[PDB]
Amino acid sequence: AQNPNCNIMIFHPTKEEFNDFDKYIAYMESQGAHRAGLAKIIPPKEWKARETYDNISEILIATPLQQVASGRAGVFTQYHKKKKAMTVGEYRHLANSKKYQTPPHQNFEDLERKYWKNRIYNSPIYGADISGSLFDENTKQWNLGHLGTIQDLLEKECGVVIEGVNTPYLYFGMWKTTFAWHTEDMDLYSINYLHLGEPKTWYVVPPEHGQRLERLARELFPGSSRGCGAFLRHKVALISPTVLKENGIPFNRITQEAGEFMVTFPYGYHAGFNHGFNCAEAINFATPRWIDYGKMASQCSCGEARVTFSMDAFVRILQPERYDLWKRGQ
Numbered sequence: 001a002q003n004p005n006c007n008i009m010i011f012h013p014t015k016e017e018f019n020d021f022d023k024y025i026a027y028m029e030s031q032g033a034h035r036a037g038l039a040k041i042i043p044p045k046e047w048k049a050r051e052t053y054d055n056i057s058e059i060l061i062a063t064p065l066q067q068v069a070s071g072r073a074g075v076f077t078q079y080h081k082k083k084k085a086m087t088v089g090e091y092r093h094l095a096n097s098k099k100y101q102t103p104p105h106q107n108f109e110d111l112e113r114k115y116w117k118n119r120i121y122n123s124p125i126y127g128a129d130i131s132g133s134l135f136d137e138n139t140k141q142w143n144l145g146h147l148g149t150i151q152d153l154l155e156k157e158c159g160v161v162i163e164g165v166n167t168p169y170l171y172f173g174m175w176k177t178t179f180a181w182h183t184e185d186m187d188l189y190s191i192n193y194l195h196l197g198e199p200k201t202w203y204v205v206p207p208e209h210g211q212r213l214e215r216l217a218r219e220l221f222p223g224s225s226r227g228c229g230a231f232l233r234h235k236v237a238l239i240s241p242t243v244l245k246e247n248g249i250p251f252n253r254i255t256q257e258a259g260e261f262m263v264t265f266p267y268g269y270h271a272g273f274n275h276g277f278n279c280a281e282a283i284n285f286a287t288p289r290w291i292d293y294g295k296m297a298s299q300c301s302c303g304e305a306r307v308t309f310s311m312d313a314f315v316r317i318l319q320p321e322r323y324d325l326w327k328r329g330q
């Protein structure tokens with residue numbers, strides 16, 4: 001059995017191995033990468049996403065979000081307060097201001113300690129889920145806007161055409177910008193590229209142990225759990241590595257740097273934070289191995305989670321018994 005301890009694996013594909021995306025995902029899984037929930041892929045030296053990042057300043061962040069915490073340093077929720085629009089250039093200047101800039105620190109571990117000690121006392125601002133892409137159209141390898149669609153995957157595996165599209169999103173982060181514990185919609189894969197800037201630290205729970213995390217979350221956020229049987233779907237709960245370790249929850253951590261890809265695997269819970277101003281791009285995707293995870297994915301039907309149009313078909317076809325109840329929550 002490959003990677004029995006569910007360690008996060010790091011891959012260094014050659015330029016030849018970088019041609020066929022699906023093939024490489026399958027190769028990583030043949031090595032047990034998925035057991036960890038998250039893998040890092042370092043592109044070959046011959047590859048680049050686009051020529052420069054010199055001309056990105058005019059991109060608009062239509063609704064920046066201020067992430068306001070409640071709770072305690074290691075166990076907190078965050079809610080997203082909407083702010084007035086601003087450009088990426090304006091956001092970059094804000095991230096670098098004395099109020100929001102990354103503090104002096106010795107190494108990634110010192111910064112990690114400062115994050116978990118101090119995050120709740122600040123409210124960082126970020127740009128999230130901005131449809132768009134920064135890959136140049138001439139980048140033919142691992143271009144996140146040119147991947148096979150989930151709708152086509154389902155059609156290929158199960159035989160029926162469905163409506164819906166699948167396009168990338170941009171994220172602009174600053175110090176302490178936080179992504180709460182979650183799996184992807186319908187327990188899809190994700191792929192995540194860090195285009196520019198400071199690092200992003202990730203925490204992940206092996207898929208085989210996701211229920212352990214759920215059980216702990218239920219204990220630590222008891223009101224939220226009563227409100228929804230899949231409340232981690234809401235993407236607002238944080239639990240620190242110290243608290244995870246105290247509670248015996250299996251997990252791993254890794255820092256992604258600019259120029260690196262991260263893949264999350266079906267039912268791999270993840271959370272993390274940004275070290276300073278950065279830009280990432282991400283998209284969900286599927287493979288044949290996802291289908292069984294999609295069939296079995298929990299769903300939030302309390303109303304809070306969101307309205308993702310593309311998800312409808314996925315629930316409708318894979319989860320017919322649940323569909324009407326889920327559709328009401330939409």
Ligand SMILES: [NH3+]NC(=O)c1cccc(-c2nn[nH]n2)c1
Pocket residue numbers: 171173177178179184190191192200264270273274280281282
């Ligand atoms: N699955 N991918 C993610 O959860 C992900 C991808 C890119 C950026 C972020 C993110 N970075 N800061 N807040 N959220 C999350």
Ligand SMILES: [Cl-]
Pocket residue numbers: 103114115118
């Ligand atoms: Cl700090």
Ligand code: NA
Pocket residue numbers: 006007251252
């Ligand atoms: Na470990």
Ligand code: NI
Pocket residue numbers: 182183184190264270
């Ligand atoms: Ni995610």
Ligand SMILES: [Zn+2]
Pocket residue numbers: 227228229230231233234300301302303304305
């Ligand atoms: Zn819910």
